[model samples]
Target: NMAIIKEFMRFKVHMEGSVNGHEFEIEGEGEGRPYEGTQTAKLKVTKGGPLPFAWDILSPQFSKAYVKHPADIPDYLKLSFPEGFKWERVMNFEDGGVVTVTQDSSLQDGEFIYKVKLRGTNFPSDGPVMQKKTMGWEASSERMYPEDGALKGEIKQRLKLKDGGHYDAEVKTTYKAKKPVQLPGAYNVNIKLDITSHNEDYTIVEQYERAEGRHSTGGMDELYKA
Candidate 1:
C-alpha cells in the first residue's frame, strides 16, 4: 500500500535572570512543516534587556513523492528511536566541550518507547557577550510511538554556569494523525503537531555579577501506510 503523510513541529525557550544586577528576560518560539525548507526563531528581550536576536533553525523537508513498505517505516522515515535499539553519540562543541547522548529503546504493550539522556561540560552560553562563557547541563528526553501512527514526547533539562547560575526547562509535544484512507494504489493521511516549552528557576551569574543564557530544541514527525 502507498500513502501520503503531512506533519508539523514547533518549540520554544524562555529565560529570566539579571545582568550586573539589572533584571532581564528572553523568550523565543519556532515552528515548521514537512514542505518548508528552513525556519527562523526570534529571541527577544522582553524585560530589562539587551539586543534582540534571530536564530536560523533547520526543519525537515521532503523532496518529490516517494513510496516505501510499512515494514520499512522506521528506516525510510529516518526515525532515531526504532524497535530493539541502544545507541549513543558524542558531539563536540566549538569551545572545546563535548556532549554525549545515549538512547535506550523498548516495546511495551503495542507501543515503542525511547529514553534519551544528554550530559555535557564546558558548553558555550548564548549571545555575543556570553558566547565565550562555559557551562554544564544535563537533559533527558522520552519519546513514545504507536505501531500505526502519531508520536509523543517530553524533555527536561538543568543547566549550571561555571561562574554561578542555574536554570531548569521542560518541553512537551503531542501529535494527531488522521485515519488513513484506502485508494486504488495508495492511501492518504494528515498529521498535526503541537509543542510547548517553559523554563523556571533561571539565574545567570558571571564574575560575581549575575547575567544571561540560551538553548534550543527540535524534532520531526512522519507516517506511513501499507
Candidate 2:
C-alpha cells in the first residue's frame, strides 16, 4: 500500500519589521500540504510591490542507499556512515542552505526561535522568487543558481505552534547589502500565520523526486526500494 497525496493547503502571513531602522510591512500569501510525504511551503513576499526572489522550504530526509561503484555518485552525495550501513543519502532540496533552531520550553520566555541562513545552494540566483520546484531542481533542464551574486543574511523568527496550528513570528534579519540592488542593512519582520486544511479545489503533486537502490541480494530488503 502507498500514501495518498492531498491538495494544496494555504497559509496567510503578515510580515512586518525594519531594515537598519527602516520600517516596512507586507502581507504574504503561501500554500503547502501537510498530508504530502514531504513537508513543503511556498511564500510570495512583496514589499511595496513584488520581491524578486523565491522562498520555499522542504524538510530534509536521510536514508541509506547501496551503490556498486563510487563513480556513480551524484552531486551533493554523502559517502560516510557507521559500520553495518551500506550508504546514506541526504534528501534536501535546498542543498548548501542553512537553518538553526533555538528551542526554549521556558514558559517564562514564552517563545521559540528559528535562525535561517540563505547561502550557497539555498539562495536564489536571479529573477522573482518563483513557485515550488516539484521537479527535483538538480535534474531540471533549467539551472537553479543561474546568478552568481550573493545575499548573505541571518534571520531570526520567534513563535510557537499550538494544538490548533497557530502563532506569531518576530522576524529579525541582517544582510550584506550591496550595490545595484538597494537592500536594507537589518530588518524586522513580524509575521502572523493562519493555517487551514480544507480546500475544495487545488493543484496536486505536479513534480516530485524519488530515489531507489539495493544492497547485497539477501533477505526481503531487496524487495523494497525508496
Candidate 3:
C-alpha cells in the first residue's frame, strides 16, 4: 500500500523448436532474488540432452523492476543490468501509445490491470556468431485480488534475425486458485525470462513470465521447475 510489493517470485518455462530440422526441448526455472527493488533474476539453462544446436545465452539472465504508480513511469520503474551487460532494452510501458495497463477501481474482479511490453537488443554489439540481434517481446494480463487471482492470458510474439531467420513463440499461463495468494503490500510481482538460441541456424526460443513463489495454486502446475 505504501510502496511496491517485495516478495519471492518464481517462474517455470518450456520451449520446443527446430534448428537445422533437429528438434529440441528447453525446460528450466528462473529463480528470483527476494526483497530487492531491482534485481537480475538468475537462470539455470537446463539444456535438454544432445542436439544439433549449440545454445547461447543472451546475457545469462534478464533484468526486472517495476513502477507501481504511473504518475511518472520512468522515475518509478528502474531496470538494472548485470555487471558486464551488453544488450539494450526497449520498453513501451513508458512511451505514449495504445495503453496496455489499465486500473479499474470500480471493478472488483481485480482492482489493478497490467500489460507488459519489453525488448532486448544485441545489435551494434557483437556476439559469438551474429553481428546484430534483436528480440521483441510483449505480454498482457488482467488480474484481481492483488495477491490471489486466476491467470488466463496470452503472451506471444514474433522475432526476426540478421540472417532472415525467424520463429514464432507464445507462453500461455493459466491457473486456478488452490492455496490462493494474499499479499499485505502492493504486489510482489517479478517478471523473468530465459532466452536461448542455436548458434548455427539462428533458431531462437525461450520462456518469459511474472511469478510469485510464496503462494500455492492448483491450476498452474507448470509454475514450478522440475
- Give the number of the best model, judged by lDDT: 1
Task: Evaluate model 1: give its TM-score.
Answer: 0.27
Better of 2 and 3 by TM-score: 3
lDDT, candidate 3, equals 0.29
lDDT of 1 by residue, 29-77 (tens): 4433423322233345566544221110000010111112234233222
* lDDT agreement with native, every candidate: 0.30, 0.23, 0.29
Q: In model 1, how large is the Cα lDDT of residue 159?
A: 43
* TM per candidate: 0.27, 0.22, 0.29
Q: Rank the candidates by TM-score, best first.
A: 3, 1, 2
Worst 10 residues of 3 by lDDT: 98-107
Show model 2 residue runs off by greater than 4 Å.
Answer: 1-36, 46-49, 53-114, 120-222
After superposition, candidate 3 runs with Cα above 4 Å error = 1-149, 162-165, 181-226
Instruction: Give the candidate number with the greatest TM-score.
Output: 3
How does residue 135 of candidate 2 score in lDDT? 18
